[PDB]
Amino acid sequence: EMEINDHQLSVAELEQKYQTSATKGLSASLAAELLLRDGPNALRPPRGTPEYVKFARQLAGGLQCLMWVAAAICLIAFAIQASEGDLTTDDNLYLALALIAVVVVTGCFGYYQEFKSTNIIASFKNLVPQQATVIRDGDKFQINADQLVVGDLVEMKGGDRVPADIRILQAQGCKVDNSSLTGESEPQTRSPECTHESPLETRNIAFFSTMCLEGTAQGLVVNTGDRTIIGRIASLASGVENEKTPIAIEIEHFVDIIAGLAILFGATFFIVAMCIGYTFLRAMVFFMAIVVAYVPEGLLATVTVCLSLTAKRLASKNCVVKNLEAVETLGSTSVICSDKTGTLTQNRMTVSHLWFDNHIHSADTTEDQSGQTFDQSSETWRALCRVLTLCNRAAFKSGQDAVPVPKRIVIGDASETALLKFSELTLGNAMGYRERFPKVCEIPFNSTNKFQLSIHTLEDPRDPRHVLVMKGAPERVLERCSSILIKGQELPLDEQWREAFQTAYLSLGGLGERVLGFCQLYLSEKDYPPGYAFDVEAMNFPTSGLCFAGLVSMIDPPRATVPDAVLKCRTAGIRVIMVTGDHPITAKAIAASVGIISEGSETVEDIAARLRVPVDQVNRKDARACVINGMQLKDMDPSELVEALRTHPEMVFARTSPQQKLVIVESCQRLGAIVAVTGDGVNDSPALKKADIGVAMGIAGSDAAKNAADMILLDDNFASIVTGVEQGRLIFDNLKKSIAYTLTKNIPELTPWLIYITVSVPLPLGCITILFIELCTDIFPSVSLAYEKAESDIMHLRPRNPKRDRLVNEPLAAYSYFQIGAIQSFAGFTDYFTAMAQEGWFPLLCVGLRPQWENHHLQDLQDSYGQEWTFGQRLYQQYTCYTVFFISIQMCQIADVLIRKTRRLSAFQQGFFRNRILVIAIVFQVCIGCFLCYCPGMPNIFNFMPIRFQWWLVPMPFSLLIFVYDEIRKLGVRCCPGSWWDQELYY
Amino acid sequence: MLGRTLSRWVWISLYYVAFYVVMSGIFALCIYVLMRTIDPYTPDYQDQLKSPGVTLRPDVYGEKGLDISYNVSDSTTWAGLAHTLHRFLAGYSPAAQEGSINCTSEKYFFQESFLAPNHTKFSCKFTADMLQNCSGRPDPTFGFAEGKPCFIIKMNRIVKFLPGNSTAPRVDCAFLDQPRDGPPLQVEYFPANGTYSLHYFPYYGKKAQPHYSNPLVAAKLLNVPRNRDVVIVCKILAEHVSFDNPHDPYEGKVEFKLKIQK
Ligand SMILES: CCCCCCCC/C=C\CCCCCCCC(=O)OC[C@H](COP(=O)(O)OCC[N+](C)(C)C)OC(=O)CCCCCCC/C=C/CCCCCCCC
Ligand SMILES: CC(C)CCC[C@@H](C)[C@H]1CC[C@H]2[C@@H]3CC=C4C[C@@H](O)CC[C@]4(C)[C@H]3CC[C@]12C
Ligand SMILES: *[C@@H]1O[C@H](CO)[C@@H](O)[C@H](O)[C@H]1NC(C)=O
Ligand SMILES: *[C@@H]1O[C@H](CO)[C@@H](O)[C@H](O)[C@H]1NC(C)=O
Ligand SMILES: *[C@@H]1O[C@H](CO)[C@@H](O)[C@H](O)[C@H]1NC(C)=O
Ligand SMILES: *[C@@H]1O[C@H](CO)[C@@H](O)[C@H](O)[C@H]1NC(C)=O
Ligand SMILES: *[C@@H]1O[C@H](CO)[C@@H](O)[C@H](O)[C@H]1NC(C)=O
Ligand code: ALF
Ligand SMILES: [K+]
Ligand SMILES: [K+]
Ligand SMILES: [K+]
Ligand SMILES: [Mg+2]
Questions:
Q1: How many whole angstroms from B31 Cα to the centroid of ligand 1?
Q2: Do domains A6-38+127-238 and A319-345+560-716 have the same CATH topology?
Q3: Distance separating alpha carbons of residues A596 and B186, to the nearest angstrom
Q4: Ligand 1 centre from A303 Cα, in Å?
Q5: Beta-ladder partners of A860
Q6: If you ran DSSP here, which 8-state letter would residue B143 be given?
């Protein structure tokens, strides 16, 4: 039913099938019944998951669930302790509130991370027309398109969209453009003749939401609503699984790693606390504290902020992303499936090659006129330019003087527009030149002539001679021609000249070009006076014995930056596949021109032609290039499709439907590859939705393509693709560095709790201090690492392996946690013991002191000097220990942010101060720490004490040790690139 | 062979062991240097010991704070408090004060040289009999049997802390909420007026004075109503002792709830 076979059926068979008539139409009652049974002729929008449901989903995950459990434990402990009258434990309630706030803020950041600002349904809704002329039991009337049913009479008034899938019954010069189906704006003739077996290629089928450019036609409704071709395209675009981006996958991977390690640590130390003697309440509080200390509370927010900064930097280069996760996926992309028309080409016919003086010239086709021109110093060239300027019917819109010539708005056909633009570019003023040469006679390209000819008058008033100019198909011109202009001389045509012309025509047409022949004949005033009545219907024009001027060919040329961008992408290890709805010859020519097919590469057909052998005997492995059209693609199984993809590294797909583009993209994705799709069309929208990264053009892109894509090229540069690949690789490396910096500090805040539990020293670090470290002091230094430059030439590297290469891997985690956090913990404990000993508590006395230290019924505890202490004084000393450990972590994190700038290069080589953002972040961190330490009231509000400068200075040697150790490790990695050192201590 | 082969595991484990041994050695060296820098007699800083804390005996504790309750008609509610006072004063018995010497200067006992045995400083002798009636020798109930309990009040010792020598530091006990119609608390002090002699200060440390004993003041509560929830605050009246600290209720003063049933 949905598949159209009605183009293959006769009119009577169609009438019997649809219970309708070609002339009368339906009856009102039966039309109403069919409308009731089928539904309206409208695209049904599939509603997606709501925003509140998505945001609630953002409040779940490993880290979110861990923080929720910790907050629940805090609330339970507070509630139990409140029942016993121990009201001095408001810290548990405050910590639970802080954890809830952290969860909510992280959920908000995650929602911002994946937010989409595109509504693809509206774009398809605007494509649907609202008027449809219908004939129901006679009495032709006009209604809305939604009230159309399968089998119904409709009139095709020119300038209106087709209101349904319609099989043409009668047509009178009707012409449409199937741009929403093919990506091509070329007008298509519609006639009641089945010219092809496929409904997408036949001439007797019109398609829903397609413009009728000119003419009138009548037809019978075949499909309505979602059963139409455009309805299926819209359903396919809307109904695609929202598969996770690579950055989302990596984030989930390291979140699972962190959650598993947190569960392990908390569980084993809960068991240890229970075993060595502790209440279940105390042990669960210990589990909460361990989870809070280990889990990075601001990691996801920092990742989102880094993505936002990269997005801002990308938007500074005319490249906007619909969601933040798109800023990375263009890096690590291994395959680019690219549209041709409007994406690689300019979507505008341009004069490319000329054949005059027995030589083929190449005209500059760049939109900025920056390419190399051809020779324009021949009398034959001047004659040919005069012919092509005079044989112009295209009109120019006034007021376009400042508009660049390629961007001008021209009223005329595509070929006429191209010829007039070429005349404007080469010759001074085409309209002026045509004005100085009035046309006494003119024969339009109406019909039955197959050429355009006009008779003009010489510009010079002293010459009453007339010049006749002719333009048409090359062979038609050749049979009319009798001589050829060579080097400004008229030479009679002979066998050699005819053979040369035929060879040039064949070679020029083999490059997917639209060749047109031009010729001229100088008339005489004796034959026709200047005031002669050149009646068009009088046949008075002789149109014989003309002189050939030359050949002009036109193509939709590539954009100026496209070849270099493709070359750079292929240098970066990315495979570029060309998928287009255009004809195979033009597709192969454009692929060769833009670099998708490299010089020297040959297809199986090319090899067969060169070796004068049938294609079946040619080995497929010899051909580096291959072109597959839609027929072969639909006949091909998935196994043969993947076999062809693996066999031919240079692949071009031509004359493909949107479904076939989707099939190619999914086939590439099923091979474990990150696939990028660049398109600017409604036919491109499903592939754009399916691709991991979908890129659309700004100006040339349609609304459906822009809504389906998650990256828009505002200026249509197509070098922004190279920019995005570079920036994605950069952000991957910088995210590695930032996550390492964030992770390294979780160990120096977890070790104090384990030591406190096991050896019963007074508590060295508090949960509030841990939260301050996580959320206030170190967020900016970690975010500032996103401005790091590339250490090497990342554009000469191959794309990363999605399975092998992870954002956070075992070397990174092991180094960051153990090697660095161990030094940070040693610094913190050295400072802790120093601060304790300066106040009278020696380390040996500190060992096992916790039960007496935290005893409220013990107000005269003696220190190492015999001085007796109250509980409040001991608590203030404990807050001093908190602040000392905090400052040690701060200094070690300054050293860490210094060493995280490079993964392989030296800090001296990359420059200490080249990252002004990093320097400002370090200064801000130090200032915030100083404010926290020395603001009045901090001891009672946040338990921060004014510490002495010696406790600022103690962790500095440890920070220096961190810097020196990382420098030595990187030096060894550089010096020995394939040793055990490089294998094991590189991340 | 998980992740890496067995030999690679050996090498990486050996590297981590060497790394952690080096780091532990660095930490031990830092601790050793710190302990060599530490002064064995005087602490480097006393930032948390600006004012001494005050405790008392007996120290039965409620959940909210110090709370003492007993019944004069029931001897079971008295034995614990009497035993606590006895075991506390056992350390102040004269057999335990042998290492100390008799002091009569009534002024700061400044010592700049180690003239006592063990190369130590001299410490002054405080015997339990200096608490006369509340010493427990003539009355073993410590006043709890007649409804006039004795409370021993001592201030925490701080090295080189001087409470002020214009007059000896004094203990003053009074009701926290002064009753309008009720008479004020009447307390008899042992020693007379409840003063700590100035020759017990300065405290020089555990190494310098291994036999140092905190001077004691016994507060005999005379005028206490029965079957009432009274609250008594005892503070130290010294020039350099401050009791105005909201965060530390035990600094320079001690507050307890008393309830004498009948
Ligand atoms: C998975 C791998 C884990 C590896 C962990 C490291 C294990 C080894 C680390 C430490 C072990 C003990 C090292 C002790 C070094 C002491 C050096 C020393 O000779 O000093 C002498 C002092 C005694 O002096 P005194 O009393 O005579 O002085 C009196 C003052 N005067 C002299 C002025 C009169 O001896 C002392 O203090 C002894 C007490 C020292 C304090 C130890 C308290 C335990 C705390 C441990 C926390 C460590 C956390 C590590 C975090 C690693 C993260 C991965
Ligand atoms: C070091 C002394 C004090 C204790 C020795 C304990 C041993 C058995 C422990 C402590 C440190 C541990 C290592 C710490 C880090 C790593 C890197 C990781 O990617 C694989 C496991 C590995 C290699 C661990 C293996 C087991 C290990 C060597
Ligand atoms: C004190 O003890 C007596 C018994 O010796 C008892 O009767 C009395 O109720 C107790 N005091 C109070 C008021 O609880
Ligand atoms: C310390 O001095 C005391 C004084 O009584 C003496 O009993 C003891 O033996 C001495 N100990 C040492 C080790 O000198
Ligand atoms: C304490 O004992 C002495 C000597 O027996 C006596 O004089 C004094 O009055 C007693 N004080 C009180 C109030 O019991
Ligand atoms: C108190 O001690 C100071 C020295 O700190 C001394 O000068 C002064 O005379 C002393 N006053 C009294 C009353 O003993
Ligand atoms: C302190 O006690 C003595 C008796 O030793 C007495 O003479 C003096 O007046 C008392 N001081 C005060 C302030 O009552
Ligand atoms: F513009 Al196309 F296939 F070439 F959509
Ligand atoms: K943490
Ligand atoms: K997509
Ligand atoms: K996708
Ligand atoms: Mg296109």
A1: 6
A2: no
A3: 106
A4: 39
A5: none
A6: T
Q: Which numeric CATH code is attached to A350-555?
A: 3.40.1110.10
3-state secondary structure of A662: helix
Q: Domain segments of chain A: what residues? A: 6-38+127-238, 43-117+243-295, 319-345+560-716, 350-555, 746-987
Those residues with Cβ within 8 angstroms of residue A538's Cβ, 6 or more apart along the chain or in another chain: none
**What are the catalytic residues of A?**
339
Report DSSP letters for A771-813, one per residue: HHIIIIISHHHHHGGGGPPPSS-GGGSPPPPTTT--SS-HHHH
Domain A319-345+560-716 listed as CATH 2.40.180.10: no
CATH of A746-987, one of 1.10.3720.10, 2.60.40.3780, 1.20.1110.10, 3.20.20.140: 1.20.1110.10
DSSP string computed for A79-118: HHHHHTT-TT-HHHHHHHHHHHHHHHHHHHHHHHHT----
| CA nearest neighbour of A485 among A511, A456, A453, A518 | A518
Measure A877 CA to nearest chain B CA, in Å: 7
Name the DSSP class of A6: G
Q: For A820, which DSSP code?
A: I
H helices present in A398-523, as ranges? 414-426, 430-435, 474-480, 495-509
A535: region left, alpha or beta (phi > 0 left; psi from -120 to 50 alpha): beta
Which stretches does DSSP call E strand in A327-409? 335-338, 350-356, 359-362, 395-396
Is A916 in CB contact (< 8 Å) with chain B?
A: no
Place of tokens 């020089």: B204
d(CA A286, CA A289): 5
CA distances from A648 to A336, A586, A622, A640 (A): 15, 19, 9, 12
The two structure tokens encoding residue B54: 């005050």
A9, amino acid identity: L
Between CA A286 and CA A279 the distance in angstroms is 10
Q: In this structure, what token pair is assigned to residue A57?
A: 């989903």
Taking each helix axis from N to C terminus, what angle separates A821-838 and B6-37, rounded to the nearest 10 degrees? 20
Regarding the beta carbon of A658 and ligand 8, being less than 6 Å apart is answered no
Residue B21: CB partners within 8 Å, gap ≥ 6? Answer: none
Distance from CA of A834 to the nearest CA of B (A): 7
Amino acid at B63: E
Resolution, angstroms, 1 dp? 2.5
Q: Reduced to 3 states, what is the DSSP secondary structure of residue B121? A: coil
For the CA atoms of B27, B28, B34, B37, the dihedral, rounded to the nearest 10 degrees, stands at -140
What phi, psi does A265 have (nearest 5°)?
-60, -50
Cα B247–Cα B250–Cα B254 angle in degrees, nearest 5: 135
Domain spanning A6-38+127-238: CATH 3.30.70.2740? no
What kind and span of H or E run contains B85? helix B76-90
- Contact at 8 Å (CB) between A314 and A564? no
B53 inside 8 A of chain A by CB: yes
Q: Report DSSP state, residue A762.
A: P
Residue A364 Cα to chain centre, angstroms? 30
Query: From which experimental method does this structure derive?
Result: cryo-EM
